[PDB]
Amino acid sequence: RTQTGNNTTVNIIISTVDYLLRVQESISDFYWYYSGKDVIDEQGQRNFSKAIQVAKQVFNTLTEYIQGPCTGNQQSLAHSRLWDAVVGFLHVFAHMQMKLSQDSSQIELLKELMDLQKDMVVMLLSMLEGNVVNGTIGKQMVDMLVESSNNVEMILKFFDMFLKLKDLTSSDTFKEYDPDGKGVISKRDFHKAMESHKHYTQSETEFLLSCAETDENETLDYEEFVKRFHEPAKDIGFNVA
C-alpha cells in the first residue's frame, strides 16, 4: 500500500481494485450481450469461465491483502472503487443464477459463478474483520447493500427456495411415497409433493420444476437435484448470513 523509504509510492491495492472493476465491467458486458439469447454457446461459456477464473484470482488477492487484518488496506479498499464492482457482481450473480439454473447445459458455469460469489462474500467478510460499532466500513457496506437491494433480495429468495428443498426431500412424504432406494420420481408426483408440503408458492414450484432436468421417462433424480442445488447454498448462504 505504501513504500515508506521510497521517493515515489504506488498504491498496488488501488491498482488491483481498479483491475477488478475493469474485469467486472467486461463480465457485465458479456452478461448483457447474452441475456437476450436463450442459451450460451461453447465460445461464450469458455470465455465466461476464463473471466470467472481471473475475477476469482483477483478477489483472492484482495482478501490476502486485507486479512490479518490490515487496517490501512481495509480503509484504502473502503474508500476505493470496490463497492461499484461489488454492486455489478451482485447484479450479475442475481440474474445469471436465475438464467442458468433452468437449463442443464450450464452446470459448470453455474458452479464457477457461485464459487466466484463465495469468494466475493469472503472478501467482504475480511473487509468486516476487526470491525467496531458504527464503523465507516460497515456504513459503506450497508450503503452498497441498499444500492443493490433488489439483487440481494433475488439472491436471498433463490437461497431460501433451494434451502427449503432439503427439508422438502427429508420430510417423511418421500420416505413413505418412494420405497425404492434409487429415488427416481415422476414430475407429476413431485409437483404434488411440493403442493402438499405447502411451503412453496405456485411460482416457486413452477420455477423449481423448470430447473429440474426432465427425463424422457420423467424419472428425475431428486438426490442429484438437491446435491447440485442445495449444497451451493448452506455454503454461500452461510457466508451471506
Side-chain angles (χ1 to χ4, degrees), residues 15-125:
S15 296
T16 311
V17 66
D18 288 332
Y19 183 76
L20 175 76
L21 184 66
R22 284 212 290 130
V23 69
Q24 173 262 314
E25 277 152 353
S26 80
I27 288 166
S28 292
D29 283 351
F30 265 46
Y31 163 74
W32 276 118
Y33 173 81
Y34 268 108
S35 64
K37 298 176 176 63
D38 53 7
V39 72
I40 316 292
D41 54 354
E42 191 265 333
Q43 284 284 123
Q45 270 157 126
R46 237 180 356 98
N47 281 312
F48 266 114
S49 71
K50 291 193 287 185
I52 288 167
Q53 184 178 1
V54 167
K56 179 177 182 292
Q57 183 53 64
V58 177
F59 272 127
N60 289 329
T61 312
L62 290 160
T63 312
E64 203 68 39
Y65 285 163
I66 58 179
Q67 275 186 352
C70 190
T71 66
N73 287 0
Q74 271 171 352
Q75 299 298 329
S76 183
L77 278 193
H79 293 137
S80 76
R81 297 215 57 194
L82 177 81
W83 311 115
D84 312 322
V86 173
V87 166
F89 273 122
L90 278 165
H91 180 271
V92 172
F93 295 153
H95 283 79
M96 303 272 299
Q97 280 181 175
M98 279 318 164
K99 192 205 192 64
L100 304 186
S101 60
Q102 299 158 310
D103 48 356
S104 305
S105 44
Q106 307 298 323
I107 304 302
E108 62 273 15
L109 209 63
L110 191 52
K111 297 297 185 291
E112 290 161 51
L113 192 76
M114 288 183 29
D115 295 334
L116 179 59
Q117 185 172 197
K118 178 177 172 64
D119 271 18
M120 182 179 72
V121 182
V122 162
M123 197 266 307
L124 294 172
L125 277 173

Side-chain angles (χ1 to χ4, degrees), residues 159-224:
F159 281 160
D160 190 36
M161 294 182 286
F162 276 133
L163 279 173
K164 291 188 286 184
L165 188 60
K166 176 60 68 70
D167 292 330
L168 185 90
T169 194
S170 308
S171 88
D172 58 353
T173 71
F174 289 167
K175 266 70 179 174
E176 56 90 13
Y177 196 106
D178 287 307
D180 53 287
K182 179 66 176 176
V184 290
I185 182 66
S186 68
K187 186 154 276 306
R188 281 82 65 193
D189 288 15
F190 172 93
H191 186 93
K192 294 180 176 67
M194 291 192 214
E195 280 307 296
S196 84
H197 181 279
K198 286 186 287 191
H199 294 88
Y200 290 113
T201 63
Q202 184 66 41
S203 178
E204 293 182 351
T205 291
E206 293 296 327
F207 178 73
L208 261 70
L209 283 168
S210 177
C211 289
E213 188 257 342
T214 183
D215 193 359
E216 284 85 6
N217 298 114
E218 276 66 42
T219 52
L220 58 91
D221 189 46
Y222 63 88
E223 290 179 352
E224 71 90 19

